[PDB]
């Protein structure tokens, strides 16, 4: 009988896995990537999902939808919805106090619900799983952040149903992360787990209790607008001033010059997780000038120091809400691609007095991993 899949439906990035033959397989897409962007684009002739939609973003900003997870199951008048709208190139209209994203598709003006947009991202993850398994997939477990209310969970389940799946259950992402490491398999007694999630655009800290495989959410804290993208912003803003100091020219009012500097900065930051120095080499960046420069891991840590240090406040709030002491936490799990930053790891380990972090499972894949495991139960 057909296998059930585990879907990690992320704000910026999505991942799908399957549990088969006592093993977990994180499924790669038609481009060989195990992570797909949570993007949907509407063109003159077609609808694009994932990387195909992400790669054409600058040539179609208004009809490339992303961040649907920020709107899913919320009301238009919601303050969250109202402040986020100011930063999106796509139009968000009001229908009965329900948000709808409005775009131009095949000559026509069309409006879709956030659950309709996420259903498109879920249709892609499903199809990725079917090409691998060689048969049509029906059953799925889709994850949600632990702080999500019942409207947001119903709306997420609705996306699965619209995508053609039978949503067996909706579980929490920190729950899926603990299941991946087998912390639910320790038996009778109380274990306290802290999951530290630092992704592309979101930051969540959760405290769970596991007693005989039964999970209890005790505290949730964080910042829905803190992630990897902010670290790129500090690097970008650092190299704009450096180009000024050297060439006496402002690159910020050229869209392509800023887009190209961003790409370079993302990769650099990435090199610095395993290296003490990274180099930036952009040909004809602005005014015909080649920008051949370098940054150290130390100068990078300096530019982001306030951001890395602020990740300890929601750790303190979560402990104080859960009414626990740091010595009371039995396990520490690292989830999210930004947790690869050595300074992020040093800060969390030092706070927890040199204790060991659970990080061997790819931080981008750990949530889908556990969700596939849970889907097989
Ligand atoms: N291909 C691919 C791909 C795979 C996973 C992701 C998810 O990324 C989410 C966040 O995770 C960040 N991140 C990632 N993401 C994993 C990744 C792996 C490969 C590629 Cl090409 C890319 Cl770019 C990203 N690696 C980091 C690192 N080594 N040091 C610091 N931050 C890292 C990334 O910059 C982003 O902010 C994004 C792209």
Author numbering: 3 to 379
Kindly provide excerpts from the paper associated with this entry.
All different functions of Hsp70s are achieved by a transient interaction of the chaperone with substrate proteins via its C-terminal substrate binding domain (SBD). ATP binding to the NBD increases association and dissociation rates by orders of magnitude, thereby decreasing the affinity for substrates by 10- to 400-fold.
Moreover, a crystal structure of the compound in complex with Hsc70 and the Bag-domain of the nucleotide exchange factor Bag-1 clearly shows its interaction with the ATP binding pocket. To elucidate how VER-155008 affects the conformation of human Hsp70 in the absence of a nucleotide exchange factor we solved the crystal structure of the NBD of human Hsp70 in complex with VER-155008 (data collection and the refinement statistics can be found in Table S3). As expected, the adenine moiety of VER-155008 was inserted into the adenine binding pocket between Arg272 and Arg342 forming hydrogen bonds between Oγ of Ser275 and N1 of the adenine ring. O2' of the ribose part of VER-155008 makes a direct hydrogen bonding contact to Nζ of Lys271. In addition, O3' of the ribose group forms another hydrogen bond to a water molecule, which is hydrogen-bonded to Oδ of Asp234. π-stacking between the side chain of Arg272, the dichlorobenzene and the 4-cyano-benzyloxymethyl moieties is similar to the one previously described. Overall the structure is similar to the previously solved structure of VER-155008 in complex with Hsc70 NBD and the nucleotide exchange factor Bag1. The reason for this observation is most likely the absence of the nucleotide exchange factor Bag1, which is known to cause a 14° outward rotation of subdomain IIB. The crystal structure demonstrates that VER-155008 keeps the NBD in a conformation, which is about half way between the closed nucleotide bound state and the open conformation induced by the interaction with nucleotide exchange factors of the Bag-1 and Hsp110 families.
